[PDB]
Coordinates of C-alpha atoms in Angstrom, one line a residue:
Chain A
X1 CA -33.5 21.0 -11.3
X2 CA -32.7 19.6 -8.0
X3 CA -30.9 22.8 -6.9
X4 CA -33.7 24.7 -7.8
X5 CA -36.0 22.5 -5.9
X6 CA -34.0 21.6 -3.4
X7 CA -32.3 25.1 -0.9
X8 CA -29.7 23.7 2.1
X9 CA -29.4 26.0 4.7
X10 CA -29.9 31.3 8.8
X11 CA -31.3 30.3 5.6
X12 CA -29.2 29.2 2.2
X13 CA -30.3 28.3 -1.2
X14 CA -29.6 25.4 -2.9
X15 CA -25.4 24.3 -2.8
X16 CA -23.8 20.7 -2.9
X17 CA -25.6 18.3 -5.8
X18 CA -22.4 17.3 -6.9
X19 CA -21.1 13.6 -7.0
X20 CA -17.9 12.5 -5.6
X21 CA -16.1 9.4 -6.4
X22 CA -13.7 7.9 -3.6
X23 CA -10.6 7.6 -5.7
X24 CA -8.9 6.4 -2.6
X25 CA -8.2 3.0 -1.9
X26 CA -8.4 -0.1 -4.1
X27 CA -12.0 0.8 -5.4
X28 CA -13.0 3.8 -6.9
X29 CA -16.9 3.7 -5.8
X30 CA -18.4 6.4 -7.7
X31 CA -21.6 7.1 -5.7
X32 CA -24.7 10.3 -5.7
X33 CA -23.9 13.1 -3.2
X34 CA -26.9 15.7 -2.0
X35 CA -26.9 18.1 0.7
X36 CA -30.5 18.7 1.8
X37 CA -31.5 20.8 4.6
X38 CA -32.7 19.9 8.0
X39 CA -36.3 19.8 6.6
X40 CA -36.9 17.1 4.0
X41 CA -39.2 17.1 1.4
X42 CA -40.3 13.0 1.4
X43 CA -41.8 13.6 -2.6
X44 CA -38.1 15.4 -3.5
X45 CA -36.1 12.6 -1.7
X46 CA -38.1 9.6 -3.5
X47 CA -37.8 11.6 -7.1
X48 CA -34.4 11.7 -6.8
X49 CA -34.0 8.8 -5.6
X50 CA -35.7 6.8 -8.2
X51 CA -35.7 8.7 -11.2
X52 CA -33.2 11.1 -10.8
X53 CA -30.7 8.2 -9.8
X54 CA -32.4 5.3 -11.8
X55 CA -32.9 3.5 -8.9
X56 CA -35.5 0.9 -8.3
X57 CA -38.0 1.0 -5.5
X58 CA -36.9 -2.3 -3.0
X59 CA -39.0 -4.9 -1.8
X60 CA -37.3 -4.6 1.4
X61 CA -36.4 -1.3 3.7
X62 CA -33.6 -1.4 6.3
X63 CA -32.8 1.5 8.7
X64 CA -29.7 0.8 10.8
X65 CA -28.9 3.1 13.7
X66 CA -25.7 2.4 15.9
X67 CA -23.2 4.9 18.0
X68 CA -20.9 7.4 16.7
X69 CA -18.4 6.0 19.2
X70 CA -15.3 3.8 17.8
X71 CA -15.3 0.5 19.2
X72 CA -13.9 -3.1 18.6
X73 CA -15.8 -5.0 17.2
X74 CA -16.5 -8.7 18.5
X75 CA -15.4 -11.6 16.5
X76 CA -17.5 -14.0 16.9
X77 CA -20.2 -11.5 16.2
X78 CA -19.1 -9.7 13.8
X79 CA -18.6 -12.7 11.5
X80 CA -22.1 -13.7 11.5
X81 CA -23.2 -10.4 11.4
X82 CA -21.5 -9.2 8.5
X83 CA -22.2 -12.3 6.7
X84 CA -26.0 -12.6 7.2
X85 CA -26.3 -8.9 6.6
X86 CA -24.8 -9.3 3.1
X87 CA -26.7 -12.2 2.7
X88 CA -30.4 -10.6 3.2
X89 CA -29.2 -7.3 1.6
X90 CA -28.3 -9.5 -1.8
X91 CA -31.5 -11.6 -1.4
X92 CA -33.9 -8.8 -0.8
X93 CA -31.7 -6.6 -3.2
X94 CA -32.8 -3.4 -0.9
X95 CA -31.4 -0.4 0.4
X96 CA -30.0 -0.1 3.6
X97 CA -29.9 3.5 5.5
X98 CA -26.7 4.1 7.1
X99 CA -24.7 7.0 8.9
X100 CA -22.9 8.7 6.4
X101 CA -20.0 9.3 8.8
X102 CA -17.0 6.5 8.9
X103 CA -16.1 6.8 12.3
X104 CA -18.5 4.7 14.6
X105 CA -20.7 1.4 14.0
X106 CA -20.6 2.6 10.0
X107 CA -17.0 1.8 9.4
X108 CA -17.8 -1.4 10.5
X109 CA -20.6 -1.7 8.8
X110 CA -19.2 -0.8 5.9
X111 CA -15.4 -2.8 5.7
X112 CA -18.1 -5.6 6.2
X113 CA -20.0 -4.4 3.2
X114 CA -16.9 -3.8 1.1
X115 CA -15.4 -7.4 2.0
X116 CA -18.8 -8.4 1.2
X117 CA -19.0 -6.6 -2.2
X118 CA -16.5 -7.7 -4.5
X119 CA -24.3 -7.4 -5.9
X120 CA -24.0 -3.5 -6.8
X121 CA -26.2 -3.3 -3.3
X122 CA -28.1 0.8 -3.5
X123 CA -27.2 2.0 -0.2
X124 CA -28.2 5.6 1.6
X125 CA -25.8 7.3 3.5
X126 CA -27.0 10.4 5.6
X127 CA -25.2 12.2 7.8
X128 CA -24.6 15.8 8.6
X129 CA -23.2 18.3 6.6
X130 CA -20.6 19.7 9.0
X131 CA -19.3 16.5 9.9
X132 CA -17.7 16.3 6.0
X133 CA -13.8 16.2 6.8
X134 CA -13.7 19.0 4.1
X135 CA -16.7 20.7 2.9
X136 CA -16.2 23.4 0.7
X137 CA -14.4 20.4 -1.8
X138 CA -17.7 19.2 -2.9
X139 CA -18.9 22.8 -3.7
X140 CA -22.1 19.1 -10.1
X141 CA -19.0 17.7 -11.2
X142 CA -17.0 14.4 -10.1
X143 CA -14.7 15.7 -7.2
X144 CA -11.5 13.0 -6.1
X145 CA -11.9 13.4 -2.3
X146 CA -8.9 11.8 -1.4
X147 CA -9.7 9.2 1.4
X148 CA -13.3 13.3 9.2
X149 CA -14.2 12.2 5.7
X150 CA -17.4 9.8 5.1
X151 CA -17.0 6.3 4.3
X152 CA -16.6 5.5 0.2
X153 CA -18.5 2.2 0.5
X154 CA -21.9 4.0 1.0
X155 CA -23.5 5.2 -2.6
X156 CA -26.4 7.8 -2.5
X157 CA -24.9 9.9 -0.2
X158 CA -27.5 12.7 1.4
X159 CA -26.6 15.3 3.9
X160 CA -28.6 18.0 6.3
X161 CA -27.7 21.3 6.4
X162 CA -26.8 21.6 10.3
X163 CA -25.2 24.6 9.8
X164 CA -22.0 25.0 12.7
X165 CA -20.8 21.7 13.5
Chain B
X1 CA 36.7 -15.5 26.3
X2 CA 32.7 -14.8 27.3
X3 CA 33.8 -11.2 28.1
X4 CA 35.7 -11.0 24.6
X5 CA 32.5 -12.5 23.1
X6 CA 30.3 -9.6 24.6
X7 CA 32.5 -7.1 23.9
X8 CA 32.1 -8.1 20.1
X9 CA 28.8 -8.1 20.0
X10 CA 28.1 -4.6 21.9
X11 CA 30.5 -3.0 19.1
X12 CA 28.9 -5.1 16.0
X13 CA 25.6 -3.9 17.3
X14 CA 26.7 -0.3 16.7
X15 CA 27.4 -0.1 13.7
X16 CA 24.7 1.8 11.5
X17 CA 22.5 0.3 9.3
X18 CA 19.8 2.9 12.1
X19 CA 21.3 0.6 14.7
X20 CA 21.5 -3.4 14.2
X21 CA 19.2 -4.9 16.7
X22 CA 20.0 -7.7 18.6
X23 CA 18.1 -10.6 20.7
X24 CA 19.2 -12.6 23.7
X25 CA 17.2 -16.2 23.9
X26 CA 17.5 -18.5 27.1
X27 CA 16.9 -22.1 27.7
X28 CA 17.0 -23.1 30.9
X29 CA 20.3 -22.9 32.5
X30 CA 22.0 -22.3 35.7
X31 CA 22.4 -19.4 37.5
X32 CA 25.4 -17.9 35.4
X33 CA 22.6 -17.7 33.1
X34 CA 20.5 -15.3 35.3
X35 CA 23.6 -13.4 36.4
X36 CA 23.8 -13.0 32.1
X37 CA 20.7 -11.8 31.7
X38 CA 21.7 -9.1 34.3
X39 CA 24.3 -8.4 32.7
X40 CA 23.0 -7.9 29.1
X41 CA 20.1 -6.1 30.8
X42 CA 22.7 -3.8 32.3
X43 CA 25.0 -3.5 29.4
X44 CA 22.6 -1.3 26.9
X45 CA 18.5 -0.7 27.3
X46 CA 18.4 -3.0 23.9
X47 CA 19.1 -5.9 25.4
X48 CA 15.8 -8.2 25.3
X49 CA 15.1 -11.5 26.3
X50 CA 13.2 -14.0 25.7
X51 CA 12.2 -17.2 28.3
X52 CA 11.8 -20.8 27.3
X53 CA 9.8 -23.2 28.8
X54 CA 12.6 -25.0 30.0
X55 CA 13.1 -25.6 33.5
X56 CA 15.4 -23.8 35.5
X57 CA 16.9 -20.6 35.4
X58 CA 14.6 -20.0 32.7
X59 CA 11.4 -21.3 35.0
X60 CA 12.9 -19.1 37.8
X61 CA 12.4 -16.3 35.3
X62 CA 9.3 -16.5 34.3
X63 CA 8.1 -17.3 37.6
X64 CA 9.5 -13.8 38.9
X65 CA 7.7 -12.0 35.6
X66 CA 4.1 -13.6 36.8
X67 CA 4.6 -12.5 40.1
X68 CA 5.8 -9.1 38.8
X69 CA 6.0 -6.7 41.4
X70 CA 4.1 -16.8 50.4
X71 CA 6.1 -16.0 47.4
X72 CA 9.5 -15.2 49.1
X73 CA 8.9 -19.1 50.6
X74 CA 8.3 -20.3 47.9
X75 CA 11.2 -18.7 45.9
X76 CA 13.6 -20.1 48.5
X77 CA 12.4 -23.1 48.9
X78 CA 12.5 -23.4 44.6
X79 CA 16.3 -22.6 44.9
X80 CA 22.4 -17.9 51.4
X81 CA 21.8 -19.1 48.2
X82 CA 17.8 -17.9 48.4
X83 CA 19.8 -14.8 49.2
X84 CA 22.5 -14.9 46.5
X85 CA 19.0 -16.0 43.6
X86 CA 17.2 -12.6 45.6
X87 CA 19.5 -10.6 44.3
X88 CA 19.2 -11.4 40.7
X89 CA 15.5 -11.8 41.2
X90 CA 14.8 -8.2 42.6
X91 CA 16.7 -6.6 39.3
X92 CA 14.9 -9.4 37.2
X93 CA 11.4 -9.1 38.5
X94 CA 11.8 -4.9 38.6
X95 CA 12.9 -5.1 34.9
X96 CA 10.4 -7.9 33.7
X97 CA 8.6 -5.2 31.5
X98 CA 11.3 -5.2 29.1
X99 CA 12.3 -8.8 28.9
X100 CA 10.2 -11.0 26.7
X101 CA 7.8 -13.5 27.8
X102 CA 6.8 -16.7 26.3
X103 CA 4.6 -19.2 27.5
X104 CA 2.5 -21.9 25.8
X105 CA -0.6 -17.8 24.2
X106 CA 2.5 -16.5 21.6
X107 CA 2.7 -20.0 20.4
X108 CA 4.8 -19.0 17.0
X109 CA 8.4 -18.4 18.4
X110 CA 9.0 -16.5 15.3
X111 CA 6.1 -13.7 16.3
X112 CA 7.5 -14.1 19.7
X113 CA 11.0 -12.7 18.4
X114 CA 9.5 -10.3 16.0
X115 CA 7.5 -8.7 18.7
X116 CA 10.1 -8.9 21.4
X117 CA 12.5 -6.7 18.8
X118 CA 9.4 -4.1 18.0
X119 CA 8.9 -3.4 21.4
X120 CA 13.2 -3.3 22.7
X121 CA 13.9 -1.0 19.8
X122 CA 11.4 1.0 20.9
X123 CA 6.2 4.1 14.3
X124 CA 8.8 4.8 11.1
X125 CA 11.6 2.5 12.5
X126 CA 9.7 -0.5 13.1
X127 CA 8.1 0.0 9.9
X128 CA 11.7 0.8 8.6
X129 CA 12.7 -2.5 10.2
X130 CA 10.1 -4.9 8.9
X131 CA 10.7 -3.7 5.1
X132 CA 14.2 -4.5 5.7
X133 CA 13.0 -7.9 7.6
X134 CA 11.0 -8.8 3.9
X135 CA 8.0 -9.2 6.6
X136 CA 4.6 -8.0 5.5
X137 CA 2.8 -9.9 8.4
X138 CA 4.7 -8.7 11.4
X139 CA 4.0 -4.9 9.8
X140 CA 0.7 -5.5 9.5
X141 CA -0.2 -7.2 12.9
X142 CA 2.3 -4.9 14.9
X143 CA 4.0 -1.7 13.1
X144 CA -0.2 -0.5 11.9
X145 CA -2.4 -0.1 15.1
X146 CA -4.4 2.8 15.8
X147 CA -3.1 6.2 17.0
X148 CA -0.6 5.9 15.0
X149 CA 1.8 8.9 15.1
X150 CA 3.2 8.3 11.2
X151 CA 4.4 11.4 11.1
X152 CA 4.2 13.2 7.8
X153 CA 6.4 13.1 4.9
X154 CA 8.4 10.2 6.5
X155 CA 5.7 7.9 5.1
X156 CA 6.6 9.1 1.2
X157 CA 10.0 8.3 1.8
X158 CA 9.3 4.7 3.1
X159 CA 7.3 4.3 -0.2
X160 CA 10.1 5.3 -2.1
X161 CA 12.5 3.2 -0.7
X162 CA 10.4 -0.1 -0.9
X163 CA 10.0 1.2 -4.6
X164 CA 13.7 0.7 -5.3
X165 CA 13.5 -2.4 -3.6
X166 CA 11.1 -5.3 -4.9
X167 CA 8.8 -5.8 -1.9
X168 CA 6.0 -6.0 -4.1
X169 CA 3.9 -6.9 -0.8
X170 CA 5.0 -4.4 0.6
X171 CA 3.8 -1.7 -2.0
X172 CA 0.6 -3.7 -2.0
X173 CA 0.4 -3.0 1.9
X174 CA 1.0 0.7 1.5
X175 CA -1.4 1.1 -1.1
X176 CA -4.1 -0.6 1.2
X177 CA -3.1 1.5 3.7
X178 CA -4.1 4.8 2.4
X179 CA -0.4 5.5 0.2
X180 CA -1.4 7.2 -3.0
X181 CA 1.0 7.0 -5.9
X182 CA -1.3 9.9 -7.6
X183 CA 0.4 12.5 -5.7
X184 CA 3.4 11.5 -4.2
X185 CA 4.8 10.6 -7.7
X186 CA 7.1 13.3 -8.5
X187 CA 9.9 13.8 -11.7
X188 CA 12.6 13.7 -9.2
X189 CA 11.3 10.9 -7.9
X190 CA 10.9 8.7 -11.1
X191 CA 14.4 10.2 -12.0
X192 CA 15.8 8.9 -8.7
X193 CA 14.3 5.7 -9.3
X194 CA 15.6 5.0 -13.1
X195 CA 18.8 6.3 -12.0
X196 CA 19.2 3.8 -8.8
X197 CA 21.5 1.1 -9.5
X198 CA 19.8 -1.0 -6.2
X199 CA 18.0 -4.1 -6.9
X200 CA 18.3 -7.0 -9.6
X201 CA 20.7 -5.6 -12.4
X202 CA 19.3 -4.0 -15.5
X203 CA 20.6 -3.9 -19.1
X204 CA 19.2 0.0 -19.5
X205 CA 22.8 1.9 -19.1
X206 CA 23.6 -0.7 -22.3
X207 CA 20.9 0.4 -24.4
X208 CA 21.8 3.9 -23.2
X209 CA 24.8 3.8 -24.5
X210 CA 24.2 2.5 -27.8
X211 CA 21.2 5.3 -28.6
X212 CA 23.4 8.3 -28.2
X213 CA 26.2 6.8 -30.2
X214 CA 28.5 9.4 -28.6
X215 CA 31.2 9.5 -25.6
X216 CA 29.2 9.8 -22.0
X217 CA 30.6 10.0 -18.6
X218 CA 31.1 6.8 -16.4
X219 CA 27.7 6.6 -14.2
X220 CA 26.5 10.1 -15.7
X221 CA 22.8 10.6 -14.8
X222 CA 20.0 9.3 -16.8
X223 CA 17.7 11.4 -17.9
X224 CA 13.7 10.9 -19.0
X225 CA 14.6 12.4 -22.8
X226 CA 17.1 10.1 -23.2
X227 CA 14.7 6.7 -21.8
X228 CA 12.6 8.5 -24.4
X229 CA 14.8 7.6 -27.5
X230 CA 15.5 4.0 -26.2
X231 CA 11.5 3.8 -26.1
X232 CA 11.8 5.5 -29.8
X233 CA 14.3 2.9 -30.6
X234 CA 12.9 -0.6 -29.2
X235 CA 9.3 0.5 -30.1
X236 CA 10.0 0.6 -33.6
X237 CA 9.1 3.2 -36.5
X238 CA 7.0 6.2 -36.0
X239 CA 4.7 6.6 -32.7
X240 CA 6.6 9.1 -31.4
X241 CA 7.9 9.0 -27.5
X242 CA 5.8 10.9 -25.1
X243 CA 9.0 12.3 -23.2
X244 CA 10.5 13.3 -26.5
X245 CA 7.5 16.2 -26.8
X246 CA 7.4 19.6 -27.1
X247 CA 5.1 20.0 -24.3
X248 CA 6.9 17.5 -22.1
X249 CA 10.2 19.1 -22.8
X250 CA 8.6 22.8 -22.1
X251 CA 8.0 21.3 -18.6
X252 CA 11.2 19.8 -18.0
X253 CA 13.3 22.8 -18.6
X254 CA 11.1 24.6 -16.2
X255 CA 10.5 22.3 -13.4
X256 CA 14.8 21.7 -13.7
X257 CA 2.2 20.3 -11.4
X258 CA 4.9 17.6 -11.8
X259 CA 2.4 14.8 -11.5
X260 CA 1.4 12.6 -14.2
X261 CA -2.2 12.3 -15.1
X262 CA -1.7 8.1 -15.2
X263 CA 1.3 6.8 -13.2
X264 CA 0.6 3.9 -13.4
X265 CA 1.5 3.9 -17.4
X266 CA 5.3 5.4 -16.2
X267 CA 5.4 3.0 -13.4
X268 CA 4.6 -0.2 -15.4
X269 CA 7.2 1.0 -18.0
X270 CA 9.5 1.6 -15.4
X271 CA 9.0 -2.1 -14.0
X272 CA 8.9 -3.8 -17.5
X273 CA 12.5 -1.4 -18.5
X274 CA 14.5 -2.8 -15.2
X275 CA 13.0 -6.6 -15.7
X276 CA 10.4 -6.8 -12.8
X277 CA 7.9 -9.2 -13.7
X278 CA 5.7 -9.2 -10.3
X279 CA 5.6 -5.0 -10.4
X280 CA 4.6 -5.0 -13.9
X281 CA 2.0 -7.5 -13.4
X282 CA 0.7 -5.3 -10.3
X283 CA 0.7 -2.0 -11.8
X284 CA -1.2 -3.7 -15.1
X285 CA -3.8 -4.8 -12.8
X286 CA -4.4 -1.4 -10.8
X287 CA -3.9 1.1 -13.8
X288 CA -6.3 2.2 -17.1
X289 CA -6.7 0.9 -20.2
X290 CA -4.6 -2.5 -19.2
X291 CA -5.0 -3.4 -22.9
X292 CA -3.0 -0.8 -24.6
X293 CA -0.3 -0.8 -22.7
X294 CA -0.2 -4.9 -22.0
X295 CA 0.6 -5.3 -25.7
X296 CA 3.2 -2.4 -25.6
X297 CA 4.9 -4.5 -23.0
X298 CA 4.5 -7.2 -24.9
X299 CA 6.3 -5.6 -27.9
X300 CA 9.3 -4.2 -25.8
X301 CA 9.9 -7.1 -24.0
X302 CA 10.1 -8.8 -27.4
X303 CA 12.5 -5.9 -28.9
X304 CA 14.5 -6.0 -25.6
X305 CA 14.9 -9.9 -26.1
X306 CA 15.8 -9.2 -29.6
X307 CA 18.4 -6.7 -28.7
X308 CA 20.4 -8.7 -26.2
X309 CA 20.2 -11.7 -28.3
X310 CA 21.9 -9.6 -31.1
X311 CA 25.2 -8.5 -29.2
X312 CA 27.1 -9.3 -26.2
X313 CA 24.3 -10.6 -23.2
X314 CA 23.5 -13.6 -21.5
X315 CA 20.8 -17.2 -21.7
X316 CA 18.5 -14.4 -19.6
X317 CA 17.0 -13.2 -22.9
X318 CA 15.6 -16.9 -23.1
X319 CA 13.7 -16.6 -19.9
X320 CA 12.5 -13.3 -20.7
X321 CA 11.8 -13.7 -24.9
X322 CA 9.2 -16.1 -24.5
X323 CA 8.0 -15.4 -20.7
X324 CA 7.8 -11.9 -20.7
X325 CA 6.4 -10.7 -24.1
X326 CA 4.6 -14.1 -23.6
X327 CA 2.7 -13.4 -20.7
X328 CA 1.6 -10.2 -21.4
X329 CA 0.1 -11.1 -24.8
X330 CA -1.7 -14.2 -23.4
X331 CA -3.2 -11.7 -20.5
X332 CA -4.5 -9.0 -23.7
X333 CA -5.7 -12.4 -25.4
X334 CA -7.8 -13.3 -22.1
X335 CA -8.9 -9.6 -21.7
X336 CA -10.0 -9.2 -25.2
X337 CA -12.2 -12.6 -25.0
X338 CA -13.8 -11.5 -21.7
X339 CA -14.6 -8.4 -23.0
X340 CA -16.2 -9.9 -26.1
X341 CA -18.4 -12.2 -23.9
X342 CA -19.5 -9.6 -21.8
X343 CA -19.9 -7.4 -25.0

């Protein structure tokens, strides 16, 4: 249904709605991928997300934006911030938009997350299509994706269809 | 004597291993000392160094390495001998890059050395050299930084060869790391590595031996349908080996796409057949369906005991009856009653 409903582009119909587990590293982390276009339909988005997905609407919203560039990371601050931030996100038991690329604040974000994890917390991941290390893998069936490629921490993947990348 | 002494160690140092490194450390000392470290310096590029506190040559040293490259005063005045010191100094202070410093930031002396080899060896051999070092911190902390080169295919390898040997921390590293046992395990591979004779003996080419009940050659290679029929034999009646399939056997003849759906199942037989306790342990925690095959290691390791306790063999049987089999039962036992209180 979402294919139908949903097209991903000049123009392209639907493509992608397949789930990908991150059979990578020490954790699986079966999570929702989507590739949407560039325009959104804000009525599709919440039915998938909380029907389609069983997912719960949160009493809290967080929206995190950071830079794409790779950085260290402080430690001083990054202690704190990693713990508070798992801390509300288990308290307020909401989702939390994040890049859907690992390179950048992200990857920080989430090796906080995941040495925060082992709550089940629903996050979003959005980032562009193109910047998938390899596209064409995902062409709705579970795909390995062997672990540039988006972070496995991140459930409920969505994408935009930006075309070249 | 001294030259005898240096002589020595220049040859030991080459023989292969690649090359043996060595380390030069200094405490204090007189000038002979500084004329020494020339000396080594001069003799081959792997010659580091490494500077004490102590005062003296050793302070001399390190006070040419801060200065790098007013101070001339103050050199002479610290020691035609300011002259004679200059001329050690220059060639010290010019080469201070490669020599080792050490101060009281690098407090650990053993980092200190570990770091000051990494970096005179001059990243396959350092990772090659801290598996052979049984040093999972030192790889960690020095041999993985980003931009890494890790050229490919050299990586596999390395993963094979901690395999054979039981750097259990080391595997576990790897793993973290990004090494994936679901597609670098090949047949050859696990061929290679049931055939190795490296590592903590095994009491395989025994059972060996026995199932085929006919002449063999010294050493001859071992081959997956025979490990087969020693499962066959230990497991007891019926349940018929995996190897010893149709299928399986199909494969075999055409191989000799060669990667097993679950390796971890062949990997924690593989551990549990040549007696490694901390492997077996690992691979039940990482693999599918820990259950099943805990109590089939649980049974073998009881039939093994059994076996060696019936002919020939040694007291190990007693340390492996009864804490082998053991353990893995009491792990299903505690599996089963979690699973029953979750559901």
């Amino acid at each position: 249904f979402y294919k139908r409903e949903c097209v991903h582009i000049q123009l392209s119909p639907t493509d992608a709605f397949g789930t990908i587990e991150f059979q990578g590293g020490g954790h699986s982390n079966k999570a929702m991928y989507v590739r949407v276009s560039f325009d959104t339909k804000p009525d599709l988005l919440l039915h998938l997300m909380t029907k389609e997905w069983q997912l719960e609407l949160p009493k809290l919203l967080i929206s995190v934006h950071g830079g794409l560039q790779n950085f260290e990371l402080q430690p001083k601050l990054k202690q704190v911030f990693g713990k508070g931030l798992i801390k509300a996100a288990m308290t307020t038991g909401a989702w939390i938009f994040t890049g859907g690329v690992n390179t950048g604040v992200i990857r920080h974000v989430g090796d906080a997350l995941k040495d925060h994890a082992s709550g089940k917390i629903c996050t979003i991941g959005i980032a562009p299509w193109g910047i998938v290390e390899n596209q064409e893998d995902l062409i709705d069936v579970v795909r390995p994706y062997q672990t540039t490629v988006l972070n496995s921490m991140h459930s409920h993947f969505i994408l935009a269809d930006n075309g070249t990348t | 004597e001294v030259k005898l002494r240096r002589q020595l160690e220049k040859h030991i140092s080459l023989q292969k291993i690649q090359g043996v490194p060595v380390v030069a450390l200094i405490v204090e000392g007189g000038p002979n000392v500084i004329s020494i470290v020339l000396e080594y310096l001069r003799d081959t590029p792997p010659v580091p160094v490494v500077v004490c506190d102590g005062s003296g040559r050793a302070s001399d040293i390190l006070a040419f390495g801060h200065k790098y490259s007013s101070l001339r005063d103050q050199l002479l005045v610290t020691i035609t001998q300011a002259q004679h010191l200059f001329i050690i100094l220059m060639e010290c202070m010019k080469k201070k890059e490669l020599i080792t410093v050490f101060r009281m930031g690098h407090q650990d002396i053993d980092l200190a050395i570990l770091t000051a080899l990494l970096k005179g060896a001059n990243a396959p051999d350092q990772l090659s050299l801290a598996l052979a070092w049984n040093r999972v911190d030192i790889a960690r902390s020095q041999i993985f930084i980003y931009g890494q080169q890790w050229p490919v295919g050299s990586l596999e390898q390395a993963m094979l060869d901690a395999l054979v040997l039981d750097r259990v921390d080391f595997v576990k590293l790897l793993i973290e790391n990004g090494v994936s046992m679901h597609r670098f395990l090949t047949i050859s591979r696990l061929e290679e590595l049931y055939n190795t004779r490296h590592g903590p003996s095994n009491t395989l080419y025994h059972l060996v031996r026995d199932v085929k009940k006919g002449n063999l050659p010294p050493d001859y290679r071992i081959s997956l349908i025979d490990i087969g029929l020693v499962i066959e034999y230990l497991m007891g009646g019926a349940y018929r080996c995996n190897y010893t399939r149709k299928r399986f056997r199909t494969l075999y003849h055409n191989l000799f796409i060669n990667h097993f759906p679950f390796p971890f199942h062949e990997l924690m037989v593989w551990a549990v057949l040549m007696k490694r306790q901390k492997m077996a342990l690992f691979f039940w925690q990482h693999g599918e369906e820990a259950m099943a095959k805990a109590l089939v290691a649980c049974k073998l390791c009881k039939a093994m005991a059994h076996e060696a306790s019936e002919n020939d063999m040694v007291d190990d049987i007693s340390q492996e009856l009864n804490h082998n089999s053991r353990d893995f039962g009491q792990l299903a036992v505690e599996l089963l009653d979690q699973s029953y209180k979750q559901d």
